[PDB]
């Protein structure tokens, strides 16, 4: 029972950071593929992917580990961009070239998704405009700038506010639950129109001149919000509104990017080209933190190290993800078929799935009982569960996990 | 001439980020010890230490690389603290135990120095107080919260402001150049008194109730500001003022900590125990980014991964630094002796040295000509140079660098 | 043609301040009762009441003028509250005693409605809470604090923002036009529920902890917004939500108070007792500016003159208004009967009437042609007209104005 | 003893608003010339002028009262500028014509000094610049925008902050007490240089780009700060700095303007032409509140009433003040001669005098004992007394007051 002792001692020295309700503690020793092992030898099937960090497995993909060990002994990661280096150049080229839009783009590297978002804030404000529009339910980070854009759980913004002024939050086109009580699955256009109208006919009329809005920040699919997928043409309509006033569109792909939805960039599913994109988590292959902010060249700006290790890893990650897309979409069909009817709302694309329950207590029990069966799941939104297995998962491993989930749901 | 081509192509894809004046470009291939090698085979002696990131050499210390390669294959770095793990527990124990003060402390891990500072802002505001005092010339990071505390170069805060309200900046006790034109070396007490008076008799009288000031942020020695060392009893006096009103003291050791000044924590040189401390850069051994925010337990608060790789590395870093302190102070005497009279102001402690020139152009030339001789140096403040060789540097390597610097200064 | 010359010369020396579209210029010489006379001898029937300032006629009521001339020669108006004086005491007593709620209250005097609102902001924040909720379409003043709460026309908040942080705007229960496209006249409960739900299930869930919301600011009937009257039980429901979290209710009666709606305080029509109330405009009888902020005694706080002239006038105003209420409601029935079917939406209570047209151009023409007939009207909202004759208007004078309005509407 | 009863009852209904220490209560019935009479028949010689409001006597000047009674019966004061009217045109002409600078200017009317300052904030920000510099010890109003610029007593900014971001406060050139401990009377140039240096070499270097500073706000002589008169060439040097970066100079004359210092505009004593000027208090003749914001025409911008009563009064006030300047400067010599040696620092110009005592308790006693002798005085700064008799005071009345003050100072 090494775990209990480690947990107790750790709780003494570490700052408090738990969910509500809090999940069962896990003292991990190591990982392999889609499996995690605690210090007591217990095995766990991972359906969390570390929320993106481990899209390619644990501790990472074999080819990525190989790259890391080699590069680390040459030039590591100073989280700085001063030192020109081949790895940095190669990853930059891939990120600008494979991202949506065939216009010239540039990339700014950072150490995390929140830093990538902080950089995006600077980019959109470089225009001279002062206001930013974001969405209720959205999550973009915890640093002061990023948390000003975040609006997931009120408690997360407690005590230390107020936050950055000039940020306005509006309803997201959540097809299952929204302020208009519209069924976004049956009437997608109606929901999209109400959301666009709220911005254009109210926010832009009563509160802020649209010409002073620097940009609109959004997740192509809300992660922390509960894996909420908006109507297919929502971003096309949002862009129409934005273009009308010269407002920039910032696509936060920190959690949905790099293969999660079966596309290199989740926004591709919505056939929309954003002005700025943020990446992180999976970009580092599960080995290390690295963030990236891709943006139209015409928006460019005006430490002492070289981030070679992180970039070398990211470069390999991009190649593996691209090679895996067909597999991701194939395995995704299994989740689509097997998850049907397992929740009050079952929504997903690629390997990005969400299960929402009208009963929060039921949601908590499903996660709790699943953990007791050796299946790792994470909550999302108010009463949903995110089902996000590593992109490298096999059909066989997927069914092992789904069988456990189905059995748990049947008894809870 | 592989370098030129890499530089050109990289400038096309990467966001603009250069100094003023901009330093000579460097396309690094790999490093070993205190030496750096570019893609064209050119060798460089490093007197920058990556501003802390590479305190233990390039790409890092052999023992740290060993730890990294091993741990990376077990459980890497998710930049999250959810996953309990032995490495995390061990580093946490070292950071709370070896930091100043024998009272109970806790530690919150992050991915960088700016994130560590963002966390410290939340910690001091958890009290309910709204104002923060920082120092002119100080540098604490670039994210929205941290940059609100930063006041190094005005251009760095251009375009995208205003910033976080409630932050007040006051003069730092810079012994060489200050608003009072006091020679802080001859009259340290006078300078300290003027600085304390400015806060207590003006800021606290005219602008903000001291009882509403959450904390005072400071660097024990200003880094970006030009390696400005304040009078020895400055922090003792600052703490007296703070205790009087229940104001917290936040010691930013991101650049001066972990051995740079011959002490594990630079504040030790000032015999003062802070309430909160931030660490980063060197903590990750030059292999990866990791930040830490240490604070009194009574200030504690109320993702899904395990930062084992970064913590395992940090744990080893702490042991190596502690073992190296005697060496650092010994080599420091060489710099103290050899740097005398080489600038209009020569100031330093341990291996933290600053050379300030009344003539900025002269400062720029010294750095430029040194680069042409194969010696890497970084500017600081308005017209100073920071001389910060890796802590693992030998007497022989130190003299090679000092000989070059002396020769350059003599001809410029 | 003295007018044209005065207008031209005045436009040279005065700062630009015009509506869009701009109304016809008026160079007033004097007034009497409900009639205004320009410098060229042209007579105008006033249906604007100076938006409250002249509720009792022009230049004011005879009894008020008498009081003013007498008091002015004793102790005038220093816009200060330092000097104790009988007039101040008497008005204070009337304001605390006749305002809703039988609990102990206090009053803070100021010089305008925007200053009264600025004072209310301080009052609600004295609690220690940092957030404020206000309504889209609302208007509370133009000074920095008040304009942060205002959200009438975006252009009014242009250029000089961002504004006070921590202010969140939500939809008002406008029965004619709202984000839900609900007909608030046919389904009032549905609209009220959607508005309350937006705050409780979205704002309080995603954005801000309700326990940190200092207060909710609202107009009992939106003035600048277009004389928008919410469902009768809206404030009762709003108060239920507020009480649940200890949030204060601030009732801005600067435009709707003092008899306009047939009640001393417009909120009386909604059977709700607020925590704070702001008054201005009519309070000064049309003779001078004076604002008042009435609030529960338990919220009290912790220059060198005496506002006797303004208070003496206000005291008389209160008595005249109370005596006139029966008359106001009687004349109101005439407007109710005669205005029916004259606009796409006809809404009103007492002598507070609004006429909204789906066609903005039609709205502008009605106001313009009316001015050419000698009837003064003001626009409101996006395409509405406010019809607010002085409370002292006779049935005969009312019909003269209504006949003109009807004829204009019939030809436009 | 009618007073005591009025005070008790008034304290029950009125919001708390007292000084620290609090002055003796005064229940004023009426006034005449420079004399005030309470409800119990007690007579008081006024050396406060209501801090400007009553520069022309109590309740006001006979000629002003005449104008007021007449105009009030024609068109009063709606605190609005919509209604063109002769009085408004005439006052506007006088304010633009007689203010410093022969370039084209415009004027925006408001209801108070704080509103005039709020308007000035909008004017300087209309440029697009976001930062504002103000001075420690300064006072510009209590509304949210104005209080953000104010920095007199910290307690005044307690509880309800933080305030408007982008406002930076720097030391004022106070010749008696400043952060540099410079004797500004013996070494004025030294003090001016230190103040200019603080802004140019520190604020503009470390904190904010000067090109982003909209304006510098200042009082030509700090009022609440203690009637602090800066060196004669301070504003000339301040303007040189401002012109260098296109920064605007805002001169707040709300307390020092309109004859107080022997000049129509106090800045005239410093031979400097500002870009924006604010006026209030005395402008209304002691009869009513009216504010004015005068500014260069090239800075112009892009309710329903006519402020005729207030403007008619202001127009007369301007003529009387201009006629009285010779008298003010003459009587001023008496105060200069008679006040010498009566305090630790005696400073003044025209009829604007300040007496500072190193002993605060002594300062409080002088004011208290003076009140007991029937002489009204107000405190200022930390331990000073402002001596500001009405501009209409006779030599005989001045000596009566000075004799009392001298006797009190001799026994305290
Ligand atoms: C997780 C997440 C972030 C935060 O990324 P970090 O590396 O933890 O700072 C930002 N945006 C989105 C959409 C996320 O899911
Ligand atoms: C470099 C530095 C920071 C920034 O650390 P990052 O890891 O680059 O975010 C913060 N504070 C100080 C004192 C620094 O020197
Ligand atoms: C007009 C108005 C104000 C502004 O009053 P002022 O005296 O012009 O400052 C504030 N609130 C409401 C509801 C108003 O109608
Ligand atoms: C008194 C004063 C103000 C405030 O004027 P109000 O009419 O009370 O708002 C502003 N500035 C200065 C310099 C003052 O002395």
């Amino acid at each position: 029972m090494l775990s209990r002792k480690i947990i107790e001692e750790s709780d003494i020295y570490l700052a408090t950071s738990t969910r509500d309700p809090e999940l069962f503690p896990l003292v991990i020793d190591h990982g392999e593929g889609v499996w995690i092992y605690d210090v007591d030898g217990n095995k766990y099937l991972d359906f969390t992917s570390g929320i993106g960090v481990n899209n390619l497995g644990w501790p990472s993909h074999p080819e990525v580990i190989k790259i890391g060990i080699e590069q680390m002994q040459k030039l590591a990661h100073a989280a700085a961009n001063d030192f020109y280096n081949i790895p940095q150049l190669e990853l930059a080229k891939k990120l600008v070239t494979y991202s949506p839009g065939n216009f010239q783009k540039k990339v700014f590297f950072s150490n995390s998704g929140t830093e990538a978002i902080e950089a995006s804030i600077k980019v959109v404000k470089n225009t001279g405009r002062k206001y930013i529009i974001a969405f209720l339910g959205g999550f973009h980070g915890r640093t002061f700038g990023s948390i000003s854009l975040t609006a997931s759980k009120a408690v997360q913004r407690s005590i230390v506010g107020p936050f950055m002024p000039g940020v306005i939050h509006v309803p997201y086109p959540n097809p299952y639950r929204n302020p208009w009580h519209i069924n976004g699955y049956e009437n997608p256009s109606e929901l999209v129109n109400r959301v666009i109208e709220f911005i254009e006919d109210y926010i832009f009329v009563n509160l802020v001149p649209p010409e002073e809005v620097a940009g609109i920040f959004f997740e192509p699919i809300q992660g922390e919000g509960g894996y909420v997928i908006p109507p297919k043409n929502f971003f096309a309509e949002l862009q129409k509104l934005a273009k009308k006033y010269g407002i920039l569109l910032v696509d936060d792909e920190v959690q949905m990017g790099l293969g999660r939805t079966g596309k290199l960039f989740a926004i591709e599913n919505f056939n929309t080209v954003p002005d700025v994109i943020t990446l992180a988590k999976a970009l580092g292959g599960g080995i290390m933190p690295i963030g990236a902010t891709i943006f139209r060249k015409d928006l460019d700006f005006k430490t002492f190290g070289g981030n070679a290790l992180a970039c070398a890893i990211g470069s390999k990650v991009i190649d593996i993800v691209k090679d895996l897309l067909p597999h991701v979409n194939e395995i995704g069909k299994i989740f689509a078929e097997e998850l049907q009817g397992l929740a009050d709302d079952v929504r997903g694309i690629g390997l990005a799935w969400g299960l929402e329950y009208n009963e929060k207590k039921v949601r908590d029990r499903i996660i709790g009982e699943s953990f007791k069966r050796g299946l790792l799941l994470l909550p999302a939104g108010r009463s949903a569960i995110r089902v996000i297995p590593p992109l490298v998962i096999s059909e066989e491993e997927a069914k092992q996990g789904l069988d456990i989930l189905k059995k748990v749901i049947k008894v809870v």
Side-chain angles (χ1 to χ4, degrees), chain A:
Chain A
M1 188 62 252
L2 299 64
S3 296
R4 191 157 53 189
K5 172 60 178 179
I6 293 169
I7 295 177
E8 304 185 311
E9 208 180 315
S10 292
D11 284 343
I12 294 181
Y13 299 108
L14 298 173
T16 302
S17 177
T18 60
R19 291 183 169 67
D20 176 53
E22 59 183 61
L23 307 176
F24 286 115
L26 197 65
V27 191
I28 302 69
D29 175 68
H30 69 284
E32 181 183 297
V34 299
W35 305 90
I36 292 303
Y37 303 89
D38 64 24
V39 296
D40 294 316
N42 300 297
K43 182 182 65 177
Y44 291 92
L45 174 53
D46 176 51
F47 262 29
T48 79
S49 296
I51 308 175
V53 176
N54 293 85
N55 278 182
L56 301 183
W58 303 74
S60 183
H61 186 292
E63 291 177 54
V64 177
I65 296 292
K66 186 173 183 175
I67 291 291
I69 291 174
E70 177 181 55
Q71 187 59 49
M72 176 181 20
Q73 307 180 67
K74 293 184 61 182
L75 189 64
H77 191 206
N81 315 311
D82 310 288
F83 289 22
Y84 285 96
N85 64 77
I86 301 181
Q88 178 183 60
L89 169 57
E90 291 311 312
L91 176 55
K93 292 164 59 182
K94 296 185 181 185
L95 296 183
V96 295
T97 303
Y98 298 137
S99 48
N102 283 316
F103 45 74
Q104 288 174 290
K105 292 163 282 187
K106 281 181 173 292
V107 56
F108 173 75
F109 293 109
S110 64
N111 299 115
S112 63
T114 191
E115 278 184 23
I117 283 291
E118 291 272 353
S120 63
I121 292 173
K122 297 181 178 63
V123 171
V124 299
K125 285 189 168 183
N126 234 284
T127 57
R129 300 190 178 197
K130 306 174 293 290
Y131 303 100
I132 293 178
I133 290 178
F135 291 93
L136 290 168
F139 186 87
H140 301 289
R142 294 175 178 288
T143 46
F144 197 78
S146 305
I147 202 171
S148 294
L149 302 185
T150 296
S152 181
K153 290 179 176 58
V155 65
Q156 304 178 310
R157 289 169 54 109
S158 65
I159 313 303
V160 306
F163 300 102
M164 200 171 76
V167 179
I168 304 169
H169 286 85
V170 301
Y172 191 79
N174 181 322
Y176 190 61
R177 289 285 179 284
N178 55 77
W180 300 275
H181 290 291
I182 294 178
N183 179 315
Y185 297 116
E186 304 184 310
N187 314 102
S189 295
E190 197 187 324
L191 178 58
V192 168
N193 292 339
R194 291 301 89 69
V195 170
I196 297 300
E197 280 163 25
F198 190 98
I199 298 171
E200 183 162 39
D201 302 333
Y202 289 92
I203 301 306
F204 290 169
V205 172
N206 297 134
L207 199 59
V208 58
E211 296 298 305
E212 288 185 42
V213 176
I216 296 168
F217 284 63
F218 60 77
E219 288 163 270
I221 291 178
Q222 292 190 321
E224 297 315 302
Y227 275 60
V228 181
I229 305 174
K232 191 181 181 63
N233 85 311
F234 170 60
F235 297 113
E237 280 299 299
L238 185 67
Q239 183 163 59
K240 175 185 295 183
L241 177 64
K243 294 294 185 184
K244 190 173 181 179
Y245 301 105
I247 299 171
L248 300 170
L249 290 191
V250 182
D251 170 34
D252 186 350
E253 302 253 359
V254 168
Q255 191 173 330
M256 301 299 157
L258 307 180
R260 173 52 58 195
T261 71
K263 297 287 189 178
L264 185 58
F265 291 84
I267 192 67
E268 289 172 47
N269 293 295
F270 300 91
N271 303 293
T272 300
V273 176
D275 298 292
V276 182
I277 296 177
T278 51
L279 293 175
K281 294 198 177 80
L283 186 57
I287 296 180
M288 68 204 317
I290 172 176
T293 303
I294 306 167
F295 56 85
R296 281 166 32 189
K297 177 181 179 301
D298 50 52
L299 305 171
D300 187 32
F301 307 78
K302 299 304 180 63
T303 61
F304 194 61
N307 57 29
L309 174 57
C311 287
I313 286 175
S315 181
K316 178 60 63 181
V317 168
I318 293 299
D319 293 340
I320 294 176
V321 170
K322 286 173 60 65
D323 289 321
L324 288 176
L325 298 190
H327 172 77
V328 172
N329 289 300
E330 273 298 308
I331 302 298
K333 295 174 186 173
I334 296 171
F335 282 78
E337 180 66 49
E338 309 308 317
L339 293 177
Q340 293 311 306
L342 300 186
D344 295 306
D345 188 40
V346 180
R347 48 189 185 245
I349 181 167
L351 285 177
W353 293 83
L355 301 173
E356 187 170 344
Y357 299 89
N358 299 319
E359 206 78 298
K360 178 179 176 296
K361 41 299 307 175
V362 170
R363 188 287 300 279
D364 294 329
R365 290 168 186 158
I366 294 175
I367 291 181
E369 293 307 329
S370 290
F371 179 96
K372 294 178 179 178
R373 299 316 304 181
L375 176 65
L376 303 178
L377 293 170
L378 292 173
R382 182 193 72 79
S383 57
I385 301 174
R386 68 191 83 190
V387 179
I388 44 183
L391 310 182
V392 295
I393 194 167
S394 65
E395 186 178 314
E396 185 280 299
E397 298 168 326
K399 290 177 182 180
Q400 277 194 63
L402 287 166
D403 286 336
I404 291 179
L405 181 57
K406 288 175 178 176
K407 294 178 68 173
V408 171
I409 293 175
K410 285 187 178 179
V411 296
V412 170

